[PDB]
Type IV major pilin protein PilA
Amino acid sequence: FTLIELMIVVAIIGILAAIAIPQYQNYVARSEGASALATINPLKTTVEESLSRGIAGSKIKIGTTASTATETYVGVEPDANKLGVIAVAIEDSGAGDITFTFQTGTSSPKNATKVITLNRTADGVWACKSTQDPMFTPKGCDN
Amino acid sequence: FTLIELMIVVAIIGILAAIAIPQYQNYVARSEGASALATINPLKTTVEESLSRGIAGSKIKIGTTASTATETYVGVEPDANKLGVIAVAIEDSGAGDITFTFQTGTSSPKNATKVITLNRTADGVWACKSTQDPMFTPKGCDN
Amino acid sequence: FTLIELMIVVAIIGILAAIAIPQYQNYVARSEGASALATINPLKTTVEESLSRGIAGSKIKIGTTASTATETYVGVEPDANKLGVIAVAIEDSGAGDITFTFQTGTSSPKNATKVITLNRTADGVWACKSTQDPMFTPKGCDN
Amino acid sequence: YVGVEPDANKLGVIAVAIEDSGAGDITFTFQTGTSSPKNATKVITLNRTADGVWACKSTQDPMFTPKGCDN
């Protein structure tokens, strides 16, 4: 062994120890929101079916407790998605809101304690809102 | 540390830095059009219902301002879809056109400033047209 | 940089490069047939109306050339659906057949050059047939 | 704003300029006060066509160009 090889190796080590690293948080922050809505959107179909068939609101709940000719139970647990929690509460007058609240022990720091919601007016119009940042909100709701 | 390991690592780095990347623009360009029509097609049902019930045209508008026994308001905002803007204007003679204009601040560069339209003849025939490229136009209209 | 990280990355790359992919052709092959019949079924209503009102057959055609008190023209072009072509030819004796022929430049390879048909007997009975595979034929016709 | 300074790597300088039509080029120019004599004043570039195709080129010697671009 000589000093030339060792010095060249030391120099190449320092050279390699210079690669830059860009940001990688917005990607996950957007992927979380792209999944939350994709998971909590289909419930509108069951809500509309239950409201148009004949049964009134309130009885519409979540979980996995079978079904009957009076109450409706969509086949998803309130904590099926480990990213957050889902909550539904349809009033007797048809108006209601299905909300998804991000959990702090699973979701990302930016999307922590944030809430998305889909509301149904009394006449029968579906709107949606969220509390996340503008760049992280999906391309289907406001803020 | 020796020079063999460092040189092998440098060579493997260059080897890995050679993966090709194909195109990925036509996918989004087609997905945007597949969603635009899917969003702006159902309005024909409400248009036909309003024209066949008894109320005349013109009064048919968009937004969320309730409804009555004279005017019709389909439950969608003029900017519900962030990809573009919707516009309806049914004439008193029944003939009209429902158009969707892509916005430059949301849509893709290729599908920017493009317009799709569904027209209703005076006799009662529905046609559709668009201004996008042939490969990006959906499989239900011309160009 | 060291060899451990590079080798772990190379191993994880190979691990990820192992996801299986199932078949996805029967889905489109069935969706095409589910749309063809849904598009070419409603013409039976106009056919029956024209045959029961008073006008004889033959004059019943397709396209968009207005209508009068002698000839009937259903408001659809012979190539409205880009998946195939429609053809109607009602005989003077009432018997006829409305057929849909899939095109090779738009339809899928499996559903290429295939033909569906709805025939009307002389007495007044509607039957339907097709030439597609058994698994791709809709649940309303034979083969 | 990608999280990297224009002179993050002391070996050279980075420059990006995407046109309004989508076409653009990201280039890396080696500096004379840090890079080696052979790789001095050399420039690597990655260009994006208008349709959407990524190509890459460089001005270094053939034996020094990586195994993913031409010269």
Notes: Strands of chain A lie at 61-63, 73-75, 84-90, 96-102, 115-120, 126-130.
